[PDB]
């Protein structure tokens, strides 16, 4: 506490602190821009994040 997390898909963020922010973990932004090659989804993730619940925030970070 706080423990660095490595998700299956090889993303990194500091749990839980990186999920308690208005912005999503920077690892998820990069993944969506470069790997998924879809920058509009990354900017669309930024818009949903503040209104998301913690459970959804965790779920998204784990599987993205």
């Amino acid at each position: 506490w706080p423990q660095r997390v490595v998700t299956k898909k090889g993303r990194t963020f500091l749990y839980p602190n990186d999920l308690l922010q208005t912005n999503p973990p920077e690892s998820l932004i990069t993944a969506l821009v470069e790997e998924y090659q879809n920058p509009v989804s990354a900017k669309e993730l930024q818009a949903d994040w503040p209104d998301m619940s913690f459970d959804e925030r965790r779920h998204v970070a784990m599987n993205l």
Partner: nanobody
Amino acid sequence: KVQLQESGGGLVQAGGSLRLSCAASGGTFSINTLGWYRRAPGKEREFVARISSGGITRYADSVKGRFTISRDNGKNTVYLDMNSLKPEDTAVYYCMYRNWGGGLDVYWGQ
């Protein structure tokens, strides 16, 4: 693998109050954003209301204050309580199921 069955709706006279409901099945719900889009007779899909997994409502300016969107976790249903309807609100109302996980898929109702 994700079902969206909408109910309610019909024909009402100005000033009335209709209620739309949409039920989801086949995946998660509590950790999902649901909403409603409407397409007027000659127009295109238009945002009406959103509600996030955290329970945060977003409304379009034209329908704000009149329409009210709510969700029922554990029943897998989202409700849109329309009040003081007007002729311009005549449209086909579609359900929305906004799930991320894999990388943002968007699902609609019939």
